């Protein structure tokens, strides 16, 4: 098992609360139900993005999963991310892209070896 | 709908012009047929980046949209965005990869759901 | 041919070696047959990064490839590439995760067209 989140914004460095990577490594387990030692967080702050033409505060992201991917999860996932991104950034939902993909375990790589 | 374009590339970010992402919106608005609303773009220079063992400048690029990607589709971005990549940031088009995704509607998250 | 290689780290810059890209791009090329005319690499240092929610260093890589991707080979890629981020970034291979993906060549641009 594994699952991956990355989170691109261009809201500053100095706006992402201390705590965020815990934060989203907690709830991400929760929510794929993952034994947290397997999430993998990665935050990008500062970074140069657009969303609809406005650079006003924008997020594109993506989790990458070994199972724990499809219609209603999804769904749950992206109220989650997108509730998380705006009580913790301040990035309005409409204003973010979560990209899901539900990776094959002999495709994913970790110690030495894969999954499969 | 929804289509998100992402560049990394070894350029400085002061050889990024300050309306490129504005640029790169509209044009992938017209070539999609998509309203630019739909159109998110991250531009990410001065990268630690090598093609061909070279590190003169190159970009690694990927385009991700709900719909409107296909073999001649894609044959057609390719030689807009490299248009695009080699004017404004002075790549040259055989230094530029681009990796194409259709999603579907049920693996992209926006505004607290998804679009399917 | 295609492949590309993208490693995200929190290890700071100054911790990647000289001559690491060179590195990756021959042994990727030896790894995967291709020459490394068609090699492109990518190493991000410096990251707001967790895994296993620690932030003792660690990576998140992609390989991207027309081909070459499999049970085995990727099995043999990782053996590999975890190998050389824990001799020259210092990373433990189990705070590596390496995502494969085989590109159909329709969906890879170079240069004003597509591999198709
Ligand atoms: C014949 C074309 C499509 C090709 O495979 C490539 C060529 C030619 C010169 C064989 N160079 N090159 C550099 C990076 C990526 C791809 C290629
Ligand atoms: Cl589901
Ligand atoms: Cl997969
Ligand atoms: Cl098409
Ligand atoms: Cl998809
Ligand atoms: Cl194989
Ligand atoms: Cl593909």
């Given at each position: 098992?594994?699952?991956?989140?990355?989170?691109?914004?261009?809201?500053?460095?100095?706006?992402?609360?201390?705590?965020?990577?815990?934060?989203?490594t907690?709830?991400?387990?929760?929510?794929?139900?993952?034994?947290?030692?397997?999430?993998?967080?990665?935050?990008?702050?500062?970074?140069?993005?657009?969303?609809?033409?406005?650079?006003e505060?924008?997020?594109?992201?993506?989790?990458?999963?070994?199972?724990?991917?499809?219609?209603?999860?999804?769904?749950?996932?992206?109220?989650?991310?997108?509730?998380?991104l705006?009580?913790?950034?301040?990035?309005?939902?409409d204003?973010?892209?979560?990209?899901?993909?539900?990776?094959?375990?002999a495709?994913?790589?970790?110690?030495?070896?894969?999954?499969?």
């Open positions: 098992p594994a699952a991956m989140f990355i989170v691109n914004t261009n809201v500053p460095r100095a706006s992402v609360p201390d705590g965020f990577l815990s934060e989203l907690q709830q991400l387990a929760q929510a794929t139900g993952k034994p947290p030692q397997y999430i993998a967080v990665h935050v990008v702050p500062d970074q140069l993005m657009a969303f609809g033409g406005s650079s505060p924008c997020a594109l992201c993506s989790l990458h999963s070994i199972g724990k991917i499809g219609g209603a999860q999804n769904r749950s996932y992206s109220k989650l991310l997108c509730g998380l705006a009580e913790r950034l301040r990035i309005s939902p204003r973010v892209y979560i990209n899901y993909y539900d990776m094959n375990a495709n994913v790589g970790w110690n030495n070896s894969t999954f499969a």
